[PDB]
């Protein structure tokens, strides 16, 4: 039944804020957890009547989580599941994984166990974190290593924020990104990357926001997160368990990074099933910048929500296989899920309410282009050993850079061999 | 030995001891271990009156130490303008070259002693004189961005 | 990462230090009696970074000089009685520009009393970030005792960040010929023992006041007006909430690709003369282009003679984040040749809404540029001219130093120069 969500570092926490705000609205839960059962997968029940997120928030500095402790949702979460140290990772993977992360890892695991003990049938973890921060990269890797030992049979899914220069505040983010991808890869069953540049560009072009904040980005992200996790929270027929994500999206265990494409995104200022389904193959709606026409599809799911008749999905799917050139690897279907509840948007938000929406999850080799971009920026800096001393002085050996990079080159080769 | 005493008295600025020592026969052109004379030392340490006294009693204004330094090199380096003027008046070689190829102009230029640079120029310092690395004083002023010095070196 | 401990040593260190505390006390609404009198709560959110709270905010500042009279002149300044009285540590005379007296004899006699006070301040800190030292490199106390203090603090607190504002000597401002010795001996210590050093060059400050500001006879007051406007701008990110370079360690990880190349070039726009009426605030294009202009640099080096390894830029005032982004993207576009291609995305931009006093628009540049080698070469050339003739060496070696420390200091500084040159010529 149960899933535990874990939010790590600034990006993971602030996106978590936006996801649980939306979840609460989707399920009729007030910010104090009261509600005048499907979502029990994500919420425990007190029986004062209080529905509490099965969620943990962790940061090595207190400032972002202090805002959760004193905001609108100050009463929603278990307060012992809001966990903070005092000195952050300083944009340094090594400090998040070794020298600073080590001071709080045991507390975090003991607090996760407390959640896990209230579960009769825990499925696993959803882990939210940036690639670019020291805590999002390094403490996440550490936590995923411990979770693999302490919960060996449980699934682990990630929602991972891929860095963009528009909102970057550290030159070393390509290092942290490759270091954490290397050390998390064997411990993660399926990971959904969110390119901040793709979300930024959607906000500017579809929502007419001149300078997107986090908040703008995070509300859009959380609509996409919600469409992905809705099957877990509304007893669907597709992706009913965490294990099914791997089955349906990851036919190859290292290549476990599906592309999300979401439509329609409409400014607060109606499209048919065929129209929103066609919009799933337009690059401007992708959550990661890359070109699926230059790659091969290995698996595809279409997750509809709202006023969606199954026959109209079947017809629209027929049209696009008979018009577009959607090349599937030879070792070729669409899996379909329909949630009949209308999409919810936040009161505050930049998004119009729509009558029907869809999220396509496609495992395409074209996402290798996103890796190639990170790898190339890694290579430029590493060749001069720029900034490497910051890592070697914080509990890490220099050979871990080249091990991480060779692992990325293998991953790029994995993509080339499937097509 | 009166020579070692006179060298130390010239360096320390002991005008009375300089006088008593010379009256007892001290060698006005004595040298220390490195070839420095009482005039080199008075010029280095700024003792103008001792500079004048030594020059009036037989000191060689152009003596060189083991490194080719003259008194004028050292006065120009440390930046003692009055002493530079008195040395030139007594026939100091404005273009003497030391073992690094430096002239007094190079050293005043490097140390930013702009008023000494101008005095040296007016007494015929060689703007084309190159050090062992091929730099003239003008090269030094261009290479190090000293625009006030560069303008003076072309007046 | 909360508290910073400030130490100011010697005349220059204490004068620019006093000015810093005046300037940030006004930005934070702290009056000379320590009460808060401000109108914005952005002012108090990070007040603990620089102030202890008794209700009454006291600078976390330690005041040191071998020269006793410095205590008096600080105390007679506007904020002089707000400094904690037991944090004044003073000797009996003054080093006479002798680095060796500062580092080895009289300054070593005084340093343990300084460390006692340091120790005591560090104990009251919730989460000590590290240290900020203001000093000059050309004197005897701020240079020789200051660098002894740095090494002793480093060994006792090796996990905290050590930051300096180091004032580099110029013959245009002070015609003492032993200052290149003192600077070179100190630079050797700063290479090994600080994490970040802002190079405040008296040569550049003099040139700005003389040539750009048309000031006939620049005073230390004129130079220090530029210093304090630089010190306020480069600490803005430490003193207010924000995303970029928000503490000393994140600043370092952004700004220092190689541990020894930690000497930054401070630029500032607009450059003002004191008691001038800065009318017609600058545009965003004007702040951007003026910030990278050699004539706005607090280090006497032409940035276009070298290449930028990393840069941070802070804009202060009400302006469009969109037009800042555009102007900053543009100046990198046109000048891409001057930004090393092997450190992608190496210019970070912050925009903070509270402008400094007197201005509605201002910006601050913090560059790690290989052109800083021109400043080191200038000091090295002067050091070498003096040291070849062994001028005044006995004055130093008679206080315990060996001539070989001169040689070692010279060679380390020339090694530093070659390293800048190496990354200047490096290709992706
Ligand atoms: N989409 C989104 N991205 C964020 C947010 N906060 C930070 N980022 C991105 O996250 C990356 C670095 O920020 P945070 O990384 O998460 O850092 P951290 O995990 O707290 O680690 P340290 O602060 O280094 O300890 C950059 O790429 C930012 O653009 C957010 O709220 N939303
Ligand atoms: N920019 C600036 N430079 C100063 C100031 N005061 C002194 N200096 C410079 O500092 C150098 C001399 O160092 P001082 O601070 O005066 O000497 P000290 O550290 O007090 O050491 P001693 O007096 O030798 O014991 C020279 O380069 C001066 O030009 C000042 O207020 N502002
Ligand atoms: Mg953080
Ligand atoms: Mg003094």
Residue numbers in the entry:
A (entry chain A): 2 to 37, 47 to 279, 285 to 346, 349 to 436
B (entry chain F): 13 to 167
C (entry chain B): 1 to 42, 45 to 56, 59 to 360, 369 to 440
Paper quotes:
We solved the structures of T. thermophila αβ‐tubulin in complex with DARPin1 (D1; (Pecqueur et al, 2012)) at 1.75 Å resolution and paclitaxel‐stabilized T. thermophila MTs at 3.3 Å resolution. To assess structural differences between protozoan and host mammalian tubulins, we also crystallized and solved the structure of recombinant human α1β3‐tubulin in complex with D1 at 1.9 Å resolution. The overall structure of T. thermophila tubulin is similar to that of human (RMSD of 0.49 Å over the 751 Cα atoms of curved αβ‐tubulin, and RMSD of 0.77 Å over the 801 Cα atoms of straight αβ‐tubulin) or yeast tubulin (Ayaz et al, 2014) (RMSD of 0.73 Å over the 755 Cα atoms of curved αβ‐tubulin, and RMSD of 0.796 Å over the 789 Cα atoms of straight αβ‐tubulin). Next, we compared the details of all six known drug‐binding sites in mammalian tubulin with the equivalent regions in T. thermophila tubulin to identify structurally unique features of protozoan tubulin using the three structures generated here as well as the published recombinant human MT structure (Vemu et al, 2016). The residue composition of the maytansine, laulimalide/peloruside, and vinblastine sites are identical between T. thermophila and human tubulin. In the case of the taxane and pironetin sites, we found differences in one and three amino acid positions, respectively. The most prominent differences between T. thermophila and human tubulin were observed for the colchicine site that is located at the α‐β intra‐tubulin dimer interface (Ravelli et al, 2004). Notably, the residues of human tubulin of the colchicine site among different human tubulin isoforms are overall largely conserved (AppendixFigs S3 and S4). However, the aliphatic linker connecting the two rings of CA4, which is lined by hydrophobic amino acid side chains in human tubulin is replaced by polar residues in the case of protozoa tubulin.
MTs are assembled from αβ‐tubulin heterodimers and undergo phases of growth and shrinkage, a property termed dynamic instability (reviewed in Akhmanova and Steinmetz (2015)). Recent advances in the structural characterization of tubulin– and MT–agent complexes have led to the identification of six distinct drug‐binding sites in mammalian tubulin (reviewed in Steinmetz and Prota (2018)). Similarly, dinitroaniline compounds disrupt specifically plant and protozoan parasite MTs but not mammalian MTs (Fennell et al, 2008). These observations imply that fine structural differences in the architecture of drug‐binding sites between protozoan and mammalian tubulin could be exploited to develop novel parasite‐specific anti‐tubulin drugs. In this work, we provide a structural description of apicomplexan tubulin drug‐binding sites together with the comparison to their mammalian counterparts and use this information to rationally design a parasite‐specific tubulin inhibitor dubbed “parabulin”.
